[PDB]
Amino acid sequence: XXXXXXXXXXXXXXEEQRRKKRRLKKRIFAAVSEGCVEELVELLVELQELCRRRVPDFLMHKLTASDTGATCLMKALLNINPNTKEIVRILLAFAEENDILGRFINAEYTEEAYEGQTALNIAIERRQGDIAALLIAAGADVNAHAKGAFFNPKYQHEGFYFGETPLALAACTNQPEIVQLLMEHEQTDITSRDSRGNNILHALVTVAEDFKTQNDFVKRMYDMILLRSGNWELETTRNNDGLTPLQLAAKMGKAEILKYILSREIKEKRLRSLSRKFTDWAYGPVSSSLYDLTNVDTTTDNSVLEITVYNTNIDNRHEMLTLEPLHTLLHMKWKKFAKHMFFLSFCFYFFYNITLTLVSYYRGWLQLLGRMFVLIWAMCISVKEGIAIFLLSDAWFHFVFFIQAVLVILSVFLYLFAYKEYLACLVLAMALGWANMLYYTRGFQSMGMYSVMIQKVILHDVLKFLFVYIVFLLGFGVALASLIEKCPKDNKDCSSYGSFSDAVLELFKLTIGLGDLNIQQNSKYPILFLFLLITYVILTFVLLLNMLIALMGETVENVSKESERIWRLQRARTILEFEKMLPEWLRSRFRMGELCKVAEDDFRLCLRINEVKWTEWKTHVSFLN
């Protein structure tokens, strides 16, 4: 993004009292920029003090540029010089000699996109730590926020976000030692929060890249910071949206850092009070270990699982899922109730569709008896589908179920009244029904991944082929109809293509191979007709070959691999939907939580799982000696 302008060496635009004033001020700024002839700065400072001697507010105004609110020290810090430390010392000494130092160093850069900015921000972004400690020691407020536009962007591509504090900036950026200095300082605040309210930790999450980079600053800095300040009062806090930093890292597709946040095994006493993933009884490869689930068991307001699974703007959900508590929870919930209810609804729907088929085939008293309850199932499934359909590449099947039951109830209704078209609607219904059998191939891996591939092909690859095919079809169709304008001469069979749609249909038969390529009869110029038709055949062939080419390249190496992952995701989505489907009291009966006493005064929910890693253990054994 391109926008309003900043301090730069090169301006983009192409009595002697006023002239002397301009010379002196601009020379001050230019000496700050070059930062070389500090004797020039000394003479200019002596002259400014002499002018003031022959008032401090006007002095600071002559020093502080009113255009962007930029001061000489800020410009000096921007233009990084070898002596720039010396220049900062000199200017600081002169400001002390003037004694307007408070309002000076507390200057907020005044601009539209920059409502506020300390010089310390620049000291840190520029990586000067010695100067940072000096200005901090000088009496610098380390708590003011860069509540601006460039710092708080709407989109990540346009703008730089770090946390709107010095400390968050030191953390996001490399500089750790400065973090130690700021933590040591007494007037420092950690629990201060930005405009959105995201604290330091939330800010850290907004920056850690995924993809398992070899060296990551955020994975370590978070650990150090949390180890220093021992508090559950830090991660318990929330942003504007009421989101925990855990939940925030989950919303975004941030993997390895999330893995860390969910397993913090640490030995010291207060650390143990802070720890997560409490371990016991480990013995060679085998190990029991228990986790905690205070915001993870799906009972919370906006739990972790609902955020991982119902979020489609990531595509990294599968990686997140393979973590311990999540995967174990899904497996447990499956084995407890999904393996029941899934087959249950499968059998209901199967009986339903068979009944529909038989009732459609024969168009007695027991026939009416079944036909009654079929309307009940139709109405029930329609009511269940509509709520999710109105409230919203996965939910297509829901719309399809809703369409089916809608059509069935409509057909039954028009049979209740005096209508003839009803049978038509009816049969279309049951046809759609059998397509929805694909919905239940999720029950099995071998059929499920196949159905996933089928749906992917039907959505991605065929439409581009079919659109261009139909436009060629229509163009050739009108062409050939124009050639076939010769009247039938008392025999419509002599005019095979007298109708446009008839010619279309024959071309489709041709593309299959059923038809009869007639020598052009009832045609004025038959050879042109024939050449044209041949051309159509050729273009269909090459178009087909092109989609067939383009198909193989999408399947480089990730066909089966993405298929299995997507199957697992689909199972997760269904399992969690059923988990919401149950009552509250049944969920009380299924709440898998186990308590624990890790602290003197902490009694939290927990999940005990066993882990068996022959391979990692054998590596551990081999490397140990």
Applying CB under 8 A, among 347, 550, 581, 586 the residue interacting with its own copies is 550
Q: Are 164 and 124 in contact (CB under 8 A)?
A: no
Minimum distance of its own copies from residue 554's CB (angstroms)? 8
Q: Is 159 in the site for its own copies (CB under 8 A)?
A: yes
Applying CB under 8 A, among 47, 60, 532, 569 the residue interacting with its own copies is 532
Minimum distance of its own copies from residue 45's CB (angstroms)? 26
User: Which lies closer to its own copies via its Cβ, residue 15 or residue 557?
Assistant: 557
Applying CB under 8 A, among 314, 389, 400, 559 the residue interacting with its own copies is 559
Piece of the chain touching its own copies by CB under 8 A; list 136-144, 157-165, 221-229, 385-393: 157-165
Site for its own copies in 166-185 (CB under 8 A): 173-176
Would you say how long the chain is, in residues? 625
Cα 206 from Cα 248, distance rounded (Å): 9
Applying CB under 8 A, among 29, 94, 104, 217 the residue interacting with its own copies is 217
Applying CB under 8 A, among 376, 457, 494, 581 the residue interacting with its own copies is 457
Q: Is 418 in the site for its own copies (CB under 8 A)?
A: no
Structure tokens at 279: 């371990």
Applying CB under 8 A, among 482, 499, 577, 592 the residue interacting with its own copies is 482
Q: Are 314 and 348 in contact (CB under 8 A)?
A: no
Site for its own copies in 88-127 (CB under 8 A): 125, 127
305-328 b/e (C-beta count within 10 Å ≥ 16 → b): bbbbbebeebeebbbbbebbbbeb
Piece of the chain touching its own copies by CB under 8 A; list 88-96, 312-320, 373-381, 466-474: 466-474
- Side chain identity at residue 344, one-letter code: L
Cα 263 from Cα 258, distance rounded (Å): 9
Instruction: Say whether 586 sits in a helix, a strand or coil.
Output: helix
- Tell me how crowded residue 104 is: count the other CB atoms within 10 A of its CB: 23
Q: Are 480 and 526 in contact (CB under 8 A)?
A: no
Minimum distance of its own copies from residue 604's CB (angstroms)? 10
Q: Is 481 in the site for its own copies (CB under 8 A)?
A: yes
Applying CB under 8 A, among 106, 555, 586, 588 the residue interacting with its own copies is 555
Piece of the chain touching its own copies by CB under 8 A; list 231-239, 314-322, 406-414, 442-450: 442-450
Q: Is 298 in the site for its own copies (CB under 8 A)?
A: no
Piece of the chain touching its own copies by CB under 8 A; list 16-24, 182-190, 298-306, 453-461: 453-461
Q: Give the count of alpha carbons within 13 A of 613, CB side only.
A: 10
Site for its own copies in 14-33 (CB under 8 A): 14
217-251 b/e (C-beta count within 10 Å ≥ 16 → b): bbeebbeebbeeeeeeebbebbbeeebbbbbbbbb
Structure tokens at 148: 């601006």
Binding-site size for its own copies (CB under 8 A) equals 124
CA 465 to chain centre: 31
Q: Which residues contact 608 (CB under 8 A, 6 or more apart)?
A: 288, 289, 290, 594
Q: Is 278 in the site for its own copies (CB under 8 A)?
A: yes
User: Which lies closer to its own copies via its Cβ, residue 450 or residue 578?
Assistant: 450
Piece of the chain touching its own copies by CB under 8 A; list 4-12, 99-107, 108-116, 570-578: 4-12
Applying CB under 8 A, among 542, 584, 600, 601 the residue interacting with its own copies is 542
Cα 114 from Cα 9, distance rounded (Å): 19
Minimum distance of its own copies from residue 513's CB (angstroms)? 4
Site for its own copies in 484-503 (CB under 8 A): 485
Piece of the chain touching its own copies by CB under 8 A; list 19-27, 58-66, 158-166, 565-573: 158-166
Minimum distance of its own copies from residue 559's CB (angstroms)? 5
Strand partners, 611: 287
To the question of whether residue 69 is assigned a binding role by annotation, the answer is: no
Piece of the chain touching its own copies by CB under 8 A; list 100-108, 296-304, 387-395, 551-559: 551-559
Piece of the chain touching its own copies by CB under 8 A; list 182-190, 305-313, 488-496, 545-553: 545-553
Cα 455 from Cα 250, distance rounded (Å): 28
**Secondary structure string (H, E, C) spanning 199-247:** CHHHHHHCCCCCCCCCCCHHHHHHHHHHHHCCCCCCCCCCCCCCCCHHH
Cα 310 from Cα 333, distance rounded (Å): 17
User: Which lies closer to its own copies via its Cβ, residue 187 or residue 446?
Assistant: 446
What does DSSP say about strands 286-292 and 605-611: parallel, antiparallel, or unpaired? Answer: antiparallel
Cα 363 from Cα 345, distance rounded (Å): 28
Site for its own copies in 353-392 (CB under 8 A): 357, 360-361, 363
User: Which lies closer to its own copies via its Cβ, residue 175 or residue 247?
Assistant: 175
Q: Is 397 in the site for its own copies (CB under 8 A)?
A: no
Q: Are 605 and 297 in contact (CB under 8 A)?
A: yes
Applying CB under 8 A, among 56, 102, 139, 475 the residue interacting with its own copies is 475
Site for its own copies in 196-215 (CB under 8 A): 209, 213, 215
Applying CB under 8 A, among 43, 55, 528, 592 the residue interacting with its own copies is 528
User: Which lies closer to its own copies via its Cβ, residue 1 or residue 336?
Assistant: 1
474-508 b/e (C-beta count within 10 Å ≥ 16 → b): eebbebbbebbeeeeeeeeeebbbbeeebbbebbe
What does DSSP say about strands 605-611 and 594-595: parallel, antiparallel, or unpaired? Answer: antiparallel
Closest CA to 378 of 417, 409, 400: 409
- Contacts with its own copies, 305-344, as mask; x by CB under 8 A: ----------------------------------------
Minimum distance of its own copies from residue 284's CB (angstroms)? 6
Q: Are 570 and 581 in contact (CB under 8 A)?
A: no
Q: Is 445 in the site for its own copies (CB under 8 A)?
A: no
Site for its own copies in 597-616 (CB under 8 A): 597-598, 603, 606, 608-610, 612, 614-615
Q: Is 424 in the site for its own copies (CB under 8 A)?
A: yes
Give the residue ranges of the annotated binding site. Answer: 513
Per the annotation, binding residues for Na(+) are 513
